[PDB]
Amino acid sequence: XXXXXXXXXXXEEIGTVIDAGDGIAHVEGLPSV
């Protein structure tokens, strides 16, 4: 049942700046990058 869980977890777009500063930034999600 764990394999099924993993497979289910496996399955336009907008990002979001988590934290920004000093010329660098972090974004969450969007696994199509």
């Binding site: 764990x2 394999x3 993993x6 496996x10 696994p31 199509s32 990058v33």
Partner: protein
């Protein structure tokens, strides 16, 4: 079965496997990369074990054009190169592909 990719940074890549699926050291792993202008086949050699079904390894090709979540297949074998008498008078790369002829040296 196969594992996945968790983080990419430089040429080192860490991958994950299910229970009872981690291979041994010095093994060949294959990964598929797709893009409109950059499609190849990554070959990786297992470097060390990080535990928690995570193994860190190195790749012999540039890692540009990669995407997370791509499964990685395993041959269950180390690196190998064909040998023979026909090797003389030919040019081969690190993988042992004949530079003179693309189809040469794939039967020995």
């Amino acid at each position: 079965t196969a594992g996945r990719v968790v983080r990419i940074t430089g040429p080192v890549v860490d991958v994950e496997f299910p229970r009872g699926s981690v291979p041994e050291l010095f093994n060949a792993l294959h990964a598929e990369i797709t893009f409109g202008a950059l499609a190849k086949t990554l070959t990786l050699e297992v470097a060390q074990h990080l535990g928690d079904s995570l193994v860190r390894c190195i790749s012999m090709q540039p890692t540009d054009g990669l995407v997370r979540g791509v499964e990685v297949t395993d041959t269950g074998a180390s690196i190998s190169v064909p040998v023979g008498d026909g090797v003389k008078g030919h040019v081969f790369n690190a993988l042992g592909d004949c530079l003179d002829d693309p189809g040469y040296g794939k039967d020995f």
